[PDB]
Write a protein that binds this ligand. Structure first.
Ligand SMILES: [Cl-]
Ligand SMILES: [Cl-]
Lengths: 114, 112
């Protein structure tokens, strides 16, 4: 279906894309790669609290969405490296503006919760 | 200031709230103006009363929403964006719109 999405529609696939890019690991992946290529072990390092499995699972959902390049190096020690595609750069700009806004306006939000 | 990379940062909770499926829809719908609970509910395909009530409570406790109760019979409740909710909403709506706009390219990468 080559339509534009409608998030208000029950079962539009944009809801899935939205979930992938704003899940707690998807956001961190997308913000981190703005700095450049990272190996699996570099992401896993910055993101305290993520298991291997859940990281593999976000990285995979983001790659099949078209946001990441994944390059294998079977050479010893083996690594897999990740970077953003041009499409992935766009969404990442949107995710980062939001993440930044939140980090910056947190004290007013916390001062609200009482 | 927040740090989303740190496992215990409250920025993660607020992020969860503005970025949930229902939270995104509430923040985008209210950009049109004040809505009743029932008008939100009819726009958001698949939402339960419980889930709609839960996201609205979280967005109001964060400072993003005004709630006005009309206890007259039949009772109703109205929501609008605070100035602060207008600001997160802009960033949320820009993200919602990019995703919907670029959905065709995403689906094309899925089939490959
Ligand atoms: Cl690796
Ligand atoms: Cl109502």
């Amino acid at each position: 279906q080559l339509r534009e999405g409608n998030l208000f529609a029950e079962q539009c696939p944009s809801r899935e894309v939205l979930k992938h890019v704003t899940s707690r690991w998807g956001v961190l992946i997308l913000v981190a790669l703005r700095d450049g290529t990272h190996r699996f072990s570099d992401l896993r390092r910055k993101m305290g609290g993520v298991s291997e499995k859940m990281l593999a699972q976000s990285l995979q959902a983001l790659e099949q969405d078209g946001f990441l390049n994944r390059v294998s190096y079977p050479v010893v020690p083996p690594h897999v490296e990740y970077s953003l595609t041009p499409l992935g750069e766009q969404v990442s700009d949107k995710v980062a503006a939001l993440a930044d806004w939140i980090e910056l306006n947190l004290p007013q939000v916390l001062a609200q919760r009482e």
